[PDB]
Amino acid sequence: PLKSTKPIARMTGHQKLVNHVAFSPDGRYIVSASFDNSIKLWDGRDGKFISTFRGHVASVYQVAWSSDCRLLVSCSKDTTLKVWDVRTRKLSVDLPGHKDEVYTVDWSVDGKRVCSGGKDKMVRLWTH
RNA sequence: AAGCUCGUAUCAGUUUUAUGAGGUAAAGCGAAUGAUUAGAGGUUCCGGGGUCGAAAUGACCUUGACCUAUUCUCAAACUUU
């Protein structure tokens, strides 16, 4: 917006709705959570399509990036949280535990913990 | 309208006894019908067509069907039961 009204690019490719989009803290890359059972990676500057993170069986509600800017955590309908190493684009860790859907995810400023909450109503905090 | 043959002689707009018959409710498309959905990324002697080497399995694209990786799981009135 500062540079211009024209959009840099339009990013198409998702099968279903984009519920949430997030730039990394450095702003280099974007991971976006989509309903299509994938969270998609895009180059933040140009808007080009890097790849799909398949692994989710169901809609992905939100994404939140780590303070360290290496990873993104998502919470999905499939009732798991997935931390993905974005750089490698490989699934770093799958963290099951919720009985029901996980609506919200957040990654702490210090980087130490990830918090989650959702349909199950219980908070689960995850640590290194 | 016009006849024949008989007698304790034909039953019931109201009440109890639930044995048969049926194709309206449910389900499926994994051998029957339909609105069996919507995309991207590859591989080319020789699946089928051009340009450029007199040539030799010298090399490089585009335009249609697949595979791998996803989504929906097909309206109650099509049929049978």
CA of A57 to C1' of B44 (A): 36
Q: What angle do CA A118, A86, A7 make, to 5 degrees?
A: 90
**A52 in contact with nucleic chain B (CB within 7 A):** yes
How far is Cα A48 from Cα A76, in angstroms, rounded to an integer? 25
Only one residue has tokens 């024209």, namely: A6
> DSSP label at A102?
E
**What is the DSSP track for A2-50?**
-S-SS-S------SS-EEEEEE-SSSSEEEEEETTS-EEEEETTT--EE
How far is Cα A20 from Cα A122, in angstroms, rounded to an integer? 22
CA of A7 to C1' of B31 (A): 53
The approach used to solve this structure was cryo-EM
**A51 in contact with nucleic chain B (CB within 7 A):** no
CA of A122 to C1' of B55 (A): 78
User: What is the experimental resolution, given in Å to one decimal place?
Assistant: 9.5
Only one residue has tokens 């080009």, namely: A48
